[PDB]
Amino acid sequence: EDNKQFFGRHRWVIYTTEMNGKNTFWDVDGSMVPPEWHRWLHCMTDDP
Amino acid sequence: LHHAVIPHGKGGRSSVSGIVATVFGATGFLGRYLVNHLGRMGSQVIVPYRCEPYDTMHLRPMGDLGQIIFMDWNGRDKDSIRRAVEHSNVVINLVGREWETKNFDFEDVFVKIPQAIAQVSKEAGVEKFIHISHLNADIKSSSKYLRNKAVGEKEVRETFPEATIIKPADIFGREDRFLNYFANIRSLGKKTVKQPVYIVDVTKGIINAIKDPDARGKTFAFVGPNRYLLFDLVQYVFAVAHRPRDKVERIHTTDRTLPHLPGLEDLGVQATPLELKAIEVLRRHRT
Amino acid sequence: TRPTVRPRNDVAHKQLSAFGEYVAEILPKYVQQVQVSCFSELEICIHPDGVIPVLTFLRDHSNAQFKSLADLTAVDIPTRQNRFEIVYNLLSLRFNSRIRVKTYTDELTPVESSVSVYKAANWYEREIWDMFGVFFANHPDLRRILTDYGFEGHPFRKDFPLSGYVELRYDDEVKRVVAEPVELAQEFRKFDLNSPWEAFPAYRQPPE
Amino acid sequence: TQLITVDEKLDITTLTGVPEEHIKTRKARIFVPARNNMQSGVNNTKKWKMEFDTRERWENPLMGWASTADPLSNLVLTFSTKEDAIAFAEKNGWSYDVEERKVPKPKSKSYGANFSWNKRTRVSTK
Amino acid sequence: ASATRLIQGLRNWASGRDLQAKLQLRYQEISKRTQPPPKLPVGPSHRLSNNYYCARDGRREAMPPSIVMSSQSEKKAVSPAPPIKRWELSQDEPYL
Amino acid sequence: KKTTGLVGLAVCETPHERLKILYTKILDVLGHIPKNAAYRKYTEQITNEKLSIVKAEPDVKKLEEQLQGGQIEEVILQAENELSLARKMIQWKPWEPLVEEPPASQWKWPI
Amino acid sequence: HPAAHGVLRLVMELSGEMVRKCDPHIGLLHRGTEKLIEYKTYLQALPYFDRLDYVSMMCNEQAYSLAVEKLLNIQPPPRAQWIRVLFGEITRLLNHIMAVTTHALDIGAMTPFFWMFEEREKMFEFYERVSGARMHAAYVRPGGVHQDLPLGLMDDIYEFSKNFSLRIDELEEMLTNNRIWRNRTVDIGVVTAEDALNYGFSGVMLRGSGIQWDLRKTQPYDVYDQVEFDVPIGSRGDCYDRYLCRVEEMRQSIRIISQCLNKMPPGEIKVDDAKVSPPKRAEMKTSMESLIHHFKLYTEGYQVPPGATYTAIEAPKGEFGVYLVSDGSSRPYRCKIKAPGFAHLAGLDKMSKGHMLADVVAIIGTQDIVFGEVDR
Amino acid sequence: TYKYVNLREPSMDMKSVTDRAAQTLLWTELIRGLGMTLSYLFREPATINYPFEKGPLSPRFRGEHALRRYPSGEERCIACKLCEAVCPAQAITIEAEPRADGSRRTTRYDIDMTKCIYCGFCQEACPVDAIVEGPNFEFSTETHEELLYNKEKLLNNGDKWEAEIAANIQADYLYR
Amino acid sequence: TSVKPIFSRDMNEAKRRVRELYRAWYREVPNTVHLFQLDISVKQGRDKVREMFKKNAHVTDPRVVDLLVIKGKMELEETINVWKQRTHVMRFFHETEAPRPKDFLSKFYVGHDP
Amino acid sequence: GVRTSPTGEKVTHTGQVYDDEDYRRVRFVGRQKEVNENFAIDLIAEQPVSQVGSRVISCDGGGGALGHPRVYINLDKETKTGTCGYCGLQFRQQH
Ligand SMILES: NC(=O)C1=CN([C@@H]2O[C@H](COP(=O)(O)OP(=O)(O)OC[C@H]3O[C@@H](n4cnc5c(N)ncnc54)[C@H](OP(=O)(O)O)[C@@H]3O)[C@@H](O)[C@H]2O)C=CC1
Ligand code: SF4
Ligand code: SF4
Ligand SMILES: [Zn+2]
């Protein structure tokens, strides 16, 4: 999360490779986030 | 017998009928019209596809909500075929390719496929198994295709006694092979008798046999109501279409009647001639 | 009383009462009921043989202009010899008042087709023909709008049930979209909710 | 303009579009709806409801729902008298049954009768 | 923005509306969430000791509509309403 | 004036005398209409008072202050329309008593 | 595709690059709205009035809730009236900016559509913070507004007001002073006042062609009588003139939002009646009668006294009318909708009697159609 | 108050007519339009790189249709059928039986995700707050078979997360 | 009982207008089977047209016959225009069964058809 | 607590598991049946029997306005524990 960027480009997620053994270096999906960071990432709060 | 198998009221569109039908092939032509008439009847249809899911995606939505079901299969093993006949009331063998490929000739489709599925069908407890074949496919000459279908008829007659061996003549429709081959050529003519029968008469007969008991074991053969000359037929096709190699031996050689075994009216469905439906279906001429 | 109760103004009530008795004085040939609700809008209940005279009067005459037309719906009340009700809903431009001409009719006898005097009435009339079935004599154009061309039944009656008799699906046997009788996936479970104990006391009809 | 008018029947059933199967095959039932007996109030009375006799309701095998091929089995009309009910049933074509109204009978009760001397009408508990 | 002077000068020169001020990339009024728990007040209800519901019984006050004539020299002809006054050109920059 | 506020309403060059002969035609055609009907009396009252509004003023702005129908020709157009309904109402005889009664179990609501 | 902007099956019979006549065959978007509301209750069939016009997401809710309140004899509380007025003005702003931008995309004019849709995305975010829905926020129950706004919203609307005044003045910079766009819509769309009053036109046509008329000024159905604004009037009955009418109504909606925020009272959310509005959660979980009224209010539906009513609001299309017919029950007996889009589509021949096909595209573009409302 | 538009006149002065003539013959206002569009060119566009930057929301969104359960306990529903009574497309279907204890419970609890129109009436209506409109909106389903949720689907969808749901409810139980 | 009928005065105008409408349908069908590129012979279409006339044969009232003339006139106008499509003309026919006969035996095996 | 069915399919918390004459088995082909893994019956014995010494006590459910409405249960049975209908957890009295 940066504070020099605006509302929408605040927070972003970078996924790792083979998080469930599925060769996810490519083709990143939605809902590859755990739900607490899913609360954090939609700007539903101001706390990690 | 068990509940959710008994019929319910009217027919079609989640009006549940009795049969649970496992249909082989069906990505081609006759299986597609048969799946359509079962969805009009409204039953649960298990179709295995080895092919792309996209072809069965385009022939998919004819079933109602969760009615048809998909699985995968091959012509090598028995595990996927047993998975196809885990629970199946009736099952039909509609398989075949009209030209030899690398991995499969005319041999071993007609030999290798019905052996395994007839074996596992007699084992795994199905009823009223229906096998198609071609008309007048004998041990006689000029067709490796037709002698291989005679070999397959021998096997399906020998093992699994309680079948329905059935055979139509050359059938014509919207995605016909040989009638489109007649329209898409380039050409010569002899004297050769031939009876064609429209495809929905055949599939009405098939579904009437698939829901009718106590006519089983009797093999059937289908009858064209005209049964006239090949060269007159090519003239009529070119006339309605406005324009002036194992397959070509099969179409030139012979198509005869066989009075030994029953046909359409012994089952009770009206035959429709070539000319009416040919005016109906011969689009795609000039302009 | 004073909070959270929408207060009425008796000025509009008295003025519309005087205007209603005035209309009943000056057109005695067709007037049956002139009723005023608590929220002060005029309702004039009329026989269906003076539609053209009443509208040709109420468009002009300089005591009430009423140029503007709106809703026409022939609200289907059964248990009557005349089922349907044509409701013209007229609005002034100088005076800020709303009048509802409720004229009655049945399923078959035509009303006089107001399109000659109110030009807005054309598609309103075509809609009422296509949904109800009130024919409009001496009218130029009666076609079907809001329903299918191969469709019949006048679906906004009470006698047309909520589902349809026809339902479309595609089939490849004839390569087209064909119509079949209805085979639903779920019942539309209708819940009885006419609860007793008479939730309004002032509207008790006289019993026998 | 002093037109034809003659006293005959009405045959809207050829206009309303509903097919002959539902014209001849079902049977209307017209009745005053009885009180839902657990509650005690008669606002749900004082009408004349018309219903249709139900038909087959099978089980949807995918969810256990009730799929029905019955378009008319969920219509119910509210009328004000029996004669308009009969007139509408003959006008709109189909057959009908008349289950006649059965009002509650008036009776006579008094607490002084509940506390009699030789008569056996006695509550014996209150 | 957050950039150099030449391109910001070309932005102001292509439209002189002070582009750096109101630029539609907000950084500051992102609303500070996890607010304190708000108490929702209630006005002229739930006050004890006088709230007879029969007093403010607004549903029951709907009278059936009053009926004037049926089928079952008086100096008159008023309108349904007074004639509505002609308006005025507003002061807030009219035309013309 | 010059180019009034409406669209399909071109300005008038003779307000007064055109409207005066209009209202004399209104009273004339109303004079053909029978007597005991209320319609003759109310039309007579409103038309004579509107004409006496006009005959007492040679103005335009004070005419708009005193008489409604803003601005000017709308009174003329509504006058022509009331003349049109008068010409219709020589026919149709609306003061005659009622055409036949309702079936009397109809207009009362609660069904 | 696009020259319907949706679906209208146009049948134009024409002598060449001209006309003879035309019929808009409409009703392809028929959905059975009045029938479905006839088989439902009031509170359950509220979303049909949310989406029979599918753009004005709050105005038609306001119209239905005012019909129920007008029949039911309940004044809504003051703060609910002010929130309803604020979102009426926001909804008017959204609907007029969609009308201008879809006129532009129908006529060509790619990018100003996109500038103003980024602004409309901001306003969708505000609706989401209020209710949760992207577009079809129900949110306006009968008897005042339900589930009032969370803490921290008015400052955001203030910031949007400043940014949006600058952006709409840059849209006037872009489009209004254009040569060929003016040449594109001046010659067409004459509307005589006779035609405007007989053919049943409503709203922006009546403003843009002659007659001084506004429901907000004439018959204030709520607290509109306490703010300073002034509706634009047309000059010649022209689509350039009507475009100017729509842009200045956007500007006056900005002024009404500004004055409404600077005169906002913090009263209360819903009515003082637990027989129409549901009791809230605290008294629900700790009362008895609140749980009773919650349970029967959501199962049975509140009863509505018998009677026939009609009302109309000033939706951004025009005189949006709703006509209720209530048997004494908890289900409305018959509802019907006066659609300004339908009455405007009725005058299609008289607007385009002597013109060509691109003029017909401009005639459909210059009147805010949704055709979900032309159907009913 | 009325403020009409388009009432000017062309001033026949030499200055005004030569300004309008320069406007005509010199393409000035078209260059002005190009200037406005390039003034929006040299800005920074407000896009978001989607699968890395999800969009903003509210704490009162309507998504997933989860169920809840008591703290260290069993299910929170009762089968009180209010949600089937208030579902405005009647997608809710509840068949209820009591189990071997005696406390009332269910057998079958169905939402049609096709017919669900995402009001929140079953969010406002449920007295124990058993059904909650879930937080996330990613359904993206291949077949029509999957979109008919069961009760065990909703329990395993409420077991997939509650910390989100509990945090949002504790954020916003005071308004609704 | 005051009734003002639509067009006729007795059934003589009813017979006149219905024979005119049948003449219109008889000469309008081969144009449509040329235009819509159908699959049906001309005499089969004409026979089902006269079948649709014969279906409503048991109607006596003049108003109902006049209203049927109105309905048929409206649909003949919408078929001589090209406003309808191949779906609608095939919807008038029946080439999608609906196979259930009127036998009591078949209505006994197929459930619950009295 | 799944049951070793002859089919081998997982049972549910409700006794709805199939037979050998069911084709809904063959519509479960290749698609793994999602059953609830944490049941609802056995999660009562996991919770201890609370002991509140008073006679008629009050149950809310873990916090105000998050849970079930106030239910005032009685404990007068000498051998049967109390049971809130909403909660499901028991109560006993302490003399
Ligand atoms: N006149 C006629 O057309 C006659 C037809 N028949 C029978 O009718 C049926 C349909 O006719 P037609 O169109 O010519 O045949 P098709 O090829 O269209 O139908 C056979 C289907 O089974 C598939 N299939 C066949 N062999 C194999 C294999 N070894 N492995 C995997 N898939 C296989 C085919 O291709 P894919 O694998 O790509 O799905 C196709 O889906 C056939 O069974 C044919 O024997 C019989 C007599 C006359
Ligand atoms: S409203 Fe809540 S408690 Fe009632 S049945 Fe629905 S989910 Fe269960
Ligand atoms: S949100 Fe969905 S499940 Fe809930 S009431 Fe609305 S349509 Fe029904
Ligand atoms: Zn408890």
PDB file of N, CA, C and O in Angstrom, chain B residues 45-81:
ATOM      1  N   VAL B  45     -29.857 -38.187 -19.933  1.00  0.00           N
ATOM      2  CA  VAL B  45     -29.039 -38.731 -21.004  1.00  0.00           C
ATOM      3  C   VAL B  45     -27.577 -38.580 -20.633  1.00  0.00           C
ATOM      4  O   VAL B  45     -27.083 -37.458 -20.473  1.00  0.00           O
ATOM      5  N   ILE B  46     -26.883 -39.701 -20.527  1.00  0.00           N
ATOM      6  CA  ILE B  46     -25.452 -39.731 -20.275  1.00  0.00           C
ATOM      7  C   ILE B  46     -24.754 -39.869 -21.612  1.00  0.00           C
ATOM      8  O   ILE B  46     -24.929 -40.876 -22.316  1.00  0.00           O
ATOM      9  N   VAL B  47     -23.961 -38.871 -21.973  1.00  0.00           N
ATOM     10  CA  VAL B  47     -23.198 -38.935 -23.206  1.00  0.00           C
ATOM     11  C   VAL B  47     -21.713 -38.846 -22.873  1.00  0.00           C
ATOM     12  O   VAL B  47     -21.285 -37.984 -22.094  1.00  0.00           O
ATOM     13  N   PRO B  48     -20.921 -39.816 -23.302  1.00  0.00           N
ATOM     14  CA  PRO B  48     -19.472 -39.688 -23.212  1.00  0.00           C
ATOM     15  C   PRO B  48     -18.904 -39.133 -24.505  1.00  0.00           C
ATOM     16  O   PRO B  48     -19.297 -39.508 -25.611  1.00  0.00           O
ATOM     17  N   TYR B  49     -17.974 -38.204 -24.354  1.00  0.00           N
ATOM     18  CA  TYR B  49     -17.282 -37.602 -25.479  1.00  0.00           C
ATOM     19  C   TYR B  49     -15.785 -37.768 -25.263  1.00  0.00           C
ATOM     20  O   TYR B  49     -15.279 -37.530 -24.161  1.00  0.00           O
ATOM     21  N   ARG B  50     -15.089 -38.225 -26.292  1.00  0.00           N
ATOM     22  CA  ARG B  50     -13.640 -38.184 -26.290  1.00  0.00           C
ATOM     23  C   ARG B  50     -13.131 -36.882 -26.861  1.00  0.00           C
ATOM     24  O   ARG B  50     -11.963 -36.541 -26.666  1.00  0.00           O
ATOM     25  N   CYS B  51     -13.999 -36.147 -27.522  1.00  0.00           N
ATOM     26  CA  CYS B  51     -13.632 -35.020 -28.352  1.00  0.00           C
ATOM     27  C   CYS B  51     -13.532 -33.757 -27.508  1.00  0.00           C
ATOM     28  O   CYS B  51     -13.417 -33.795 -26.282  1.00  0.00           O
ATOM     29  N   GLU B  52     -13.511 -32.627 -28.191  1.00  0.00           N
ATOM     30  CA  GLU B  52     -13.520 -31.329 -27.557  1.00  0.00           C
ATOM     31  C   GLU B  52     -14.855 -31.095 -26.857  1.00  0.00           C
ATOM     32  O   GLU B  52     -15.896 -31.545 -27.334  1.00  0.00           O
ATOM     33  N   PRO B  53     -14.854 -30.399 -25.715  1.00  0.00           N
ATOM     34  CA  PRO B  53     -16.128 -29.996 -25.101  1.00  0.00           C
ATOM     35  C   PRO B  53     -16.905 -28.968 -25.898  1.00  0.00           C
ATOM     36  O   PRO B  53     -18.078 -28.740 -25.591  1.00  0.00           O
ATOM     37  N   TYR B  54     -16.312 -28.341 -26.907  1.00  0.00           N
ATOM     38  CA  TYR B  54     -17.003 -27.284 -27.627  1.00  0.00           C
ATOM     39  C   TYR B  54     -18.045 -27.818 -28.603  1.00  0.00           C
ATOM     40  O   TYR B  54     -19.088 -27.180 -28.812  1.00  0.00           O
ATOM     41  N   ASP B  55     -17.798 -28.976 -29.204  1.00  0.00           N
ATOM     42  CA  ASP B  55     -18.798 -29.554 -30.094  1.00  0.00           C
ATOM     43  C   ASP B  55     -20.029 -29.997 -29.312  1.00  0.00           C
ATOM     44  O   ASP B  55     -21.173 -29.708 -29.695  1.00  0.00           O
ATOM     45  N   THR B  56     -19.814 -30.644 -28.171  1.00  0.00           N
ATOM     46  CA  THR B  56     -20.958 -30.969 -27.341  1.00  0.00           C
ATOM     47  C   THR B  56     -21.500 -29.748 -26.612  1.00  0.00           C
ATOM     48  O   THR B  56     -22.620 -29.803 -26.098  1.00  0.00           O
ATOM     49  N   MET B  57     -20.755 -28.641 -26.589  1.00  0.00           N
ATOM     50  CA  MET B  57     -21.338 -27.381 -26.155  1.00  0.00           C
ATOM     51  C   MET B  57     -22.350 -26.877 -27.171  1.00  0.00           C
ATOM     52  O   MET B  57     -23.396 -26.345 -26.795  1.00  0.00           O
ATOM     53  N   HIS B  58     -22.063 -27.028 -28.465  1.00  0.00           N
ATOM     54  CA  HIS B  58     -23.061 -26.535 -29.409  1.00  0.00           C
ATOM     55  C   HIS B  58     -24.231 -27.492 -29.552  1.00  0.00           C
ATOM     56  O   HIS B  58     -25.328 -27.053 -29.901  1.00  0.00           O
ATOM     57  N   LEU B  59     -24.039 -28.783 -29.296  1.00  0.00           N
ATOM     58  CA  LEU B  59     -25.182 -29.687 -29.283  1.00  0.00           C
ATOM     59  C   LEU B  59     -25.700 -29.954 -27.870  1.00  0.00           C
ATOM     60  O   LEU B  59     -26.472 -30.893 -27.665  1.00  0.00           O
ATOM     61  N   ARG B  60     -25.302 -29.129 -26.903  1.00  0.00           N
ATOM     62  CA  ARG B  60     -25.655 -29.214 -25.483  1.00  0.00           C
ATOM     63  C   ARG B  60     -27.065 -28.793 -25.055  1.00  0.00           C
ATOM     64  O   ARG B  60     -27.754 -29.619 -24.445  1.00  0.00           O
ATOM     65  N   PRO B  61     -27.553 -27.572 -25.306  1.00  0.00           N
ATOM     66  CA  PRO B  61     -28.680 -27.060 -24.514  1.00  0.00           C
ATOM     67  C   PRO B  61     -30.035 -27.647 -24.869  1.00  0.00           C
ATOM     68  O   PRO B  61     -31.052 -27.116 -24.419  1.00  0.00           O
ATOM     69  N   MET B  62     -30.072 -28.709 -25.667  1.00  0.00           N
ATOM     70  CA  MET B  62     -31.326 -29.355 -26.004  1.00  0.00           C
ATOM     71  C   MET B  62     -31.895 -30.102 -24.812  1.00  0.00           C
ATOM     72  O   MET B  62     -33.112 -30.287 -24.721  1.00  0.00           O
ATOM     73  N   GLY B  63     -31.042 -30.542 -23.895  1.00  0.00           N
ATOM     74  CA  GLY B  63     -31.529 -31.056 -22.637  1.00  0.00           C
ATOM     75  C   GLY B  63     -32.011 -29.940 -21.732  1.00  0.00           C
ATOM     76  O   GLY B  63     -31.639 -28.777 -21.878  1.00  0.00           O
ATOM     77  N   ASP B  64     -32.852 -30.301 -20.771  1.00  0.00           N
ATOM     78  CA  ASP B  64     -33.360 -29.318 -19.828  1.00  0.00           C
ATOM     79  C   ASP B  64     -32.389 -29.242 -18.646  1.00  0.00           C
ATOM     80  O   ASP B  64     -31.251 -29.706 -18.739  1.00  0.00           O
ATOM     81  N   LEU B  65     -32.821 -28.646 -17.532  1.00  0.00           N
ATOM     82  CA  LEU B  65     -31.972 -28.215 -16.435  1.00  0.00           C
ATOM     83  C   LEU B  65     -31.305 -29.396 -15.751  1.00  0.00           C
ATOM     84  O   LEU B  65     -31.953 -30.153 -15.025  1.00  0.00           O
ATOM     85  N   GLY B  66     -30.005 -29.556 -16.000  1.00  0.00           N
ATOM     86  CA  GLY B  66     -29.243 -30.667 -15.470  1.00  0.00           C
ATOM     87  C   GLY B  66     -29.649 -32.023 -15.986  1.00  0.00           C
ATOM     88  O   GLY B  66     -29.373 -33.032 -15.334  1.00  0.00           O
ATOM     89  N   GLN B  67     -30.291 -32.083 -17.149  1.00  0.00           N
ATOM     90  CA  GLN B  67     -30.774 -33.362 -17.645  1.00  0.00           C
ATOM     91  C   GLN B  67     -29.664 -34.161 -18.306  1.00  0.00           C
ATOM     92  O   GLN B  67     -29.346 -35.268 -17.864  1.00  0.00           O
ATOM     93  N   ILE B  68     -29.059 -33.623 -19.366  1.00  0.00           N
ATOM     94  CA  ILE B  68     -27.957 -34.351 -19.975  1.00  0.00           C
ATOM     95  C   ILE B  68     -26.721 -34.229 -19.095  1.00  0.00           C
ATOM     96  O   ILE B  68     -26.597 -33.326 -18.261  1.00  0.00           O
ATOM     97  N   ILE B  69     -25.807 -35.173 -19.259  1.00  0.00           N
ATOM     98  CA  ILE B  69     -24.593 -35.177 -18.464  1.00  0.00           C
ATOM     99  C   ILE B  69     -23.449 -35.665 -19.343  1.00  0.00           C
ATOM    100  O   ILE B  69     -23.648 -36.409 -20.310  1.00  0.00           O
ATOM    101  N   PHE B  70     -22.252 -35.181 -19.035  1.00  0.00           N
ATOM    102  CA  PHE B  70     -21.073 -35.422 -19.846  1.00  0.00           C
ATOM    103  C   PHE B  70     -20.083 -36.288 -19.090  1.00  0.00           C
ATOM    104  O   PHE B  70     -19.944 -36.171 -17.870  1.00  0.00           O
ATOM    105  N   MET B  71     -19.385 -37.144 -19.829  1.00  0.00           N
ATOM    106  CA  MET B  71     -18.152 -37.711 -19.297  1.00  0.00           C
ATOM    107  C   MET B  71     -17.185 -37.995 -20.437  1.00  0.00           C
ATOM    108  O   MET B  71     -17.465 -37.707 -21.598  1.00  0.00           O
ATOM    109  N   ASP B  72     -16.025 -38.544 -20.090  1.00  0.00           N
ATOM    110  CA  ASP B  72     -14.956 -38.798 -21.044  1.00  0.00           C
ATOM    111  C   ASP B  72     -14.722 -40.297 -21.167  1.00  0.00           C
ATOM    112  O   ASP B  72     -14.908 -41.049 -20.208  1.00  0.00           O
ATOM    113  N   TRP B  73     -14.293 -40.723 -22.353  1.00  0.00           N
ATOM    114  CA  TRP B  73     -14.123 -42.145 -22.620  1.00  0.00           C
ATOM    115  C   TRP B  73     -13.140 -42.313 -23.764  1.00  0.00           C
ATOM    116  O   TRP B  73     -12.762 -41.349 -24.430  1.00  0.00           O
ATOM    117  N   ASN B  74     -12.745 -43.563 -23.997  1.00  0.00           N
ATOM    118  CA  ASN B  74     -11.823 -43.884 -25.074  1.00  0.00           C
ATOM    119  C   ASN B  74     -12.140 -45.275 -25.606  1.00  0.00           C
ATOM    120  O   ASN B  74     -13.007 -45.982 -25.088  1.00  0.00           O
ATOM    121  N   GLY B  75     -11.409 -45.673 -26.639  1.00  0.00           N
ATOM    122  CA  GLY B  75     -11.553 -47.001 -27.191  1.00  0.00           C
ATOM    123  C   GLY B  75     -10.370 -47.888 -26.876  1.00  0.00           C
ATOM    124  O   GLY B  75      -9.876 -48.611 -27.744  1.00  0.00           O
ATOM    125  N   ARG B  76      -9.879 -47.805 -25.650  1.00  0.00           N
ATOM    126  CA  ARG B  76      -8.759 -48.628 -25.208  1.00  0.00           C
ATOM    127  C   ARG B  76      -9.061 -49.391 -23.928  1.00  0.00           C
ATOM    128  O   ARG B  76      -8.678 -50.556 -23.811  1.00  0.00           O
ATOM    129  N   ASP B  77      -9.752 -48.774 -22.977  1.00  0.00           N
ATOM    130  CA  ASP B  77      -9.879 -49.304 -21.630  1.00  0.00           C
ATOM    131  C   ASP B  77     -11.327 -49.656 -21.329  1.00  0.00           C
ATOM    132  O   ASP B  77     -12.220 -49.496 -22.160  1.00  0.00           O
ATOM    133  N   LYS B  78     -11.545 -50.142 -20.110  1.00  0.00           N
ATOM    134  CA  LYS B  78     -12.870 -50.507 -19.646  1.00  0.00           C
ATOM    135  C   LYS B  78     -13.340 -49.673 -18.467  1.00  0.00           C
ATOM    136  O   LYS B  78     -14.524 -49.741 -18.121  1.00  0.00           O
ATOM    137  N   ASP B  79     -12.451 -48.894 -17.845  1.00  0.00           N
ATOM    138  CA  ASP B  79     -12.800 -48.201 -16.609  1.00  0.00           C
ATOM    139  C   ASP B  79     -13.744 -47.042 -16.872  1.00  0.00           C
ATOM    140  O   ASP B  79     -14.724 -46.855 -16.142  1.00  0.00           O
ATOM    141  N   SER B  80     -13.489 -46.273 -17.930  1.00  0.00           N
ATOM    142  CA  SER B  80     -14.399 -45.190 -18.275  1.00  0.00           C
ATOM    143  C   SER B  80     -15.720 -45.710 -18.821  1.00  0.00           C
ATOM    144  O   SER B  80     -16.763 -45.085 -18.611  1.00  0.00           O
ATOM    145  N   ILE B  81     -15.706 -46.858 -19.495  1.00  0.00           N
ATOM    146  CA  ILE B  81     -16.954 -47.409 -20.002  1.00  0.00           C
ATOM    147  C   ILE B  81     -17.807 -47.939 -18.856  1.00  0.00           C
ATOM    148  O   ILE B  81     -19.027 -47.738 -18.826  1.00  0.00           O
TER     149      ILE B  81
END
